[PDB]
């Protein structure tokens, strides 16, 4: 049962539901692949994102919109929780919330090739 | 006027914000001081974070990227015109800085997600023929299988044989 | 896209991807052989979490001669223009949304398939 004014409007009851329904990346992710883009700015997938942010390989994870929006999620908290969850071995250059594709680029810096698949899995 | 800063990181951030405001020459037509405006946006970001850490650098980079967005030249025009004050622009979310098309798309997707997650109202024939024994209101719904009746006001359920 | 398995040319075993830590380039080496061939796709692996797959790739034209299967005269072919078409739902288990109907031209040497 809902205690606050949220008890009335379905809108402010919805965010309680999102704060309760267990939602892992698999629910909002769409397509997860890997790439040995030899430099952050190499951008073999043709992206202008790292160039403004200025490993030889990365995880790329184009997330879902109609699943991320329906949860009122953002790349901000996703990247925060990633870096907090695995520690600063991982760096995540997330996209912006203006582009059409909701990519995350994930790299490691300091048995590695399989290791991106190991952490993603 | 934004205070002068001696910090090399803050000076580079002001220069990069001014360069983002110059993108597309809109500052010439408006006659806005893009150096002063870049300094005020940086100062407002610095007043919130009070440190030059990765959080500050990420925040400045996000603003530069949104000002340089070729799909949203209106955001940069609105900042140069003073429709968005430097302090507000320094606090605004990536959702509030988005293009009007992307804002409306997100609003529609959010509204559709809410509509899809709304439980279907249980069907039946609405009728005023039945008076609820608990609340004495006539707003009831019936279904025959024996007539089952539900009061729409207090949720009381009963049957007739 | 994807990436296939490319097999070694000597042992015909599976080539694993390996970075050239000298030239900074992706290779495909073998486990049993010492066969280093130079990558082109720059990709290791993909994974469609959406499970989006086009059924028209899986629908085989031979289904048209299935007597068990409903025939329409309400959607003509596009290449030839036959009137007759069988239609069905996606037999694949990934179909909880896809009650969408897939149609096949009931005309030999055509087997044109489409979805409306
Ligand atoms: Zn071999
Ligand atoms: Zn045909």
UniProtKB/Swiss-Prot annotation, chain B:
GO molecular function: DNA binding; zinc ion binding
Subunit structure and binding partners: Interacts with EAF2. Associates with UBR5 and forms a transcription regulatory complex made of CDK9, Pol II, UBR5 and TCEA1/TFIIS. Part of TBP-based Pol II pre-initiation complex (PIC), in which Pol II core assembles with general transcription factors and other specific initiation factors including GTF2E1, GTF2E2, GTF2F1, GTF2F2, TCEA1, ERCC2, ERCC3, GTF2H2, GTF2H3, GTF2H4, GTF2H5, GTF2A1, GTF2A2, GTF2B and TBP; this large multi-subunit PIC complex mediates DNA unwinding and targets Pol II core to the transcription start site where the first phosphodiester bond forms.
Claim: Phosphoprotein is one of the keywords in the record: yes
Naturally occurring in which organism (per UniProt): Homo sapiens
Keywords annotated in UniProt: Acetylation, Chromosomal rearrangement, DNA-binding, Isopeptide bond, Metal-binding, Nucleus, Phosphoprotein, Transcription, Transcription regulation, Ubl conjugation, Zinc, Zinc-finger
Annotated GO CC locations: nucleolus; nucleoplasm; nucleus; transcription factor TFIID complex
Subcellular localization(s) per the UniProt record: Nucleus
Illness association: A chromosomal aberration involving TCEA1 may be a cause of salivary gland pleiomorphic adenomas (PA) [181030]. Pleiomorphic adenomas are the most common benign epithelial tumors of the salivary gland. Translocation t(3;8)(p21;q12) with PLAG1.
Domain TFIIS central span(s) in chain numbering: 9-125
Annotated positions binding Zn(2+): 132, 135, 151, 154
Part of the whole protein covered: 132 to 301 of 301
Superkingdom as given in the UniProt entry: Eukaryota
GO biological process: one example: transcription elongation by RNA polymerase II
Classification lineage: Eukaryota, Metazoa, Chordata, Craniata, Vertebrata
Similarity-based family: Belongs to the TFS-II family.
Protein name according to UniProt: Transcription elongation factor A protein 1
Note: S-II binds to RNA-polymerase II in the absence of transcription.
UniProt key word Nucleus: yes
Known function: Necessary for efficient RNA polymerase II transcription elongation past template-encoded arresting sites. The arresting sites in DNA have the property of trapping a certain fraction of elongating RNA polymerases that pass through, resulting in locked ternary complexes. Cleavage of the nascent transcript by S-II allows the resumption of elongation from the new 3'-terminus.
Zinc finger residue ranges, TFIIS-type: 128-159
